[PDB]
């Protein structure tokens, strides 16, 4: 339900903190990640630059 | 924000910046918009199924 196409540029360790019911230290404040949140991840190596 | 960017391999582990596309789902009352194809199956005919 409520599928959205979202993108972020955040540290690697905080990408995994978007799991439902997890209060991300940095990700949650920028974008709320409550128990009602769900989705997936598609990460790319941006460290080149 | 003074040094929130510019990952340094010498110090700090796990905070490497990554460009990530994150799908977002919510439990709002609005209707759903995603339903996987399931990969479907062959269309059998003239037999109980």
């Amino acid at each position: 339900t409520n599928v959205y196409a979202d993108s972020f540029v955040i540290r690697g360790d905080e990408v995994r903190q978007i799991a439902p019911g997890q209060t991300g230290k940095i990700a949650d404040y920028n974008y709320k990640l409550p128990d009602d949140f769900t989705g997936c991840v598609i990460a790319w190596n941006s460290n080149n630059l | 924000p003074l040094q929130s960017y510019g990952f340094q391999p010498t110090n700090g582990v796990g905070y490497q910046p990554y460009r990530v596309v994150v799908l977002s789902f919510e439990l709002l009352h609005a209707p759903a918009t995603v339903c996987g194809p399931k990969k479907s199956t062959n269309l059998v005919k003239n037999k109980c199924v």
Partner: nanobody
Framework: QVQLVESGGGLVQAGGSLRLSCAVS????????MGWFRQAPGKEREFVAT????????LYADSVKGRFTISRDTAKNMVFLQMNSLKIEDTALYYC???????????????????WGQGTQVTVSS
């Protein structure tokens, strides 16, 4: 400091096969999701592979894509990682999947797991 204990260790014959299973029970991988990752010499972290509940497709790491295999059992309630065609470059500490913060899910990123405690030391040479 304490170090994680994993099946194997010591000198490993090149091109052989070995099993990687976690021994500690205080923080099992199941709580944080079954998976495996290894730390190359220095301060480099990388991911090897993991098994998904579907059992039809296994998340393979590009570094070892198509090399490692994972066995599955209905009632064993455990995951065993099997290595195939080992090389000298495989020498690296092996760690059990653990996250510094609460989370649950499946992923294929190098920085998925990390912990201060060192892992089992595995040396591979010809």
């Amino acid at each position: 400091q304490v170090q994680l204990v994993e099946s194997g260790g010591g000198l490993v014959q090149a091109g052989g096969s070995l099993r990687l299973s976690c021994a500690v029970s205080g923080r099992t991988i199941s709580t944080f999701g079954m998976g495996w990752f290894r730390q190359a010499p220095g301060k480099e972290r990388e991911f090897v592979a993991t098994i998904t509940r579907d059992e039809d497709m296994l998340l393979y790491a590009d570094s070892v894509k198509g090399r490692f295999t994972i066995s599955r059992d209905t009632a064993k309630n455990m995951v065993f990682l099997q290595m195939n065609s080992l090389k000298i470059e495989d020498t690296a500490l092996y760690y059990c999947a653990v996250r510094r913060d609460s989370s649950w899910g499946y992923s294929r990123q190098s920085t998925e797991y990390d912990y201060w405690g060192q892992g089992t030391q595995v040396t591979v040479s010809s």
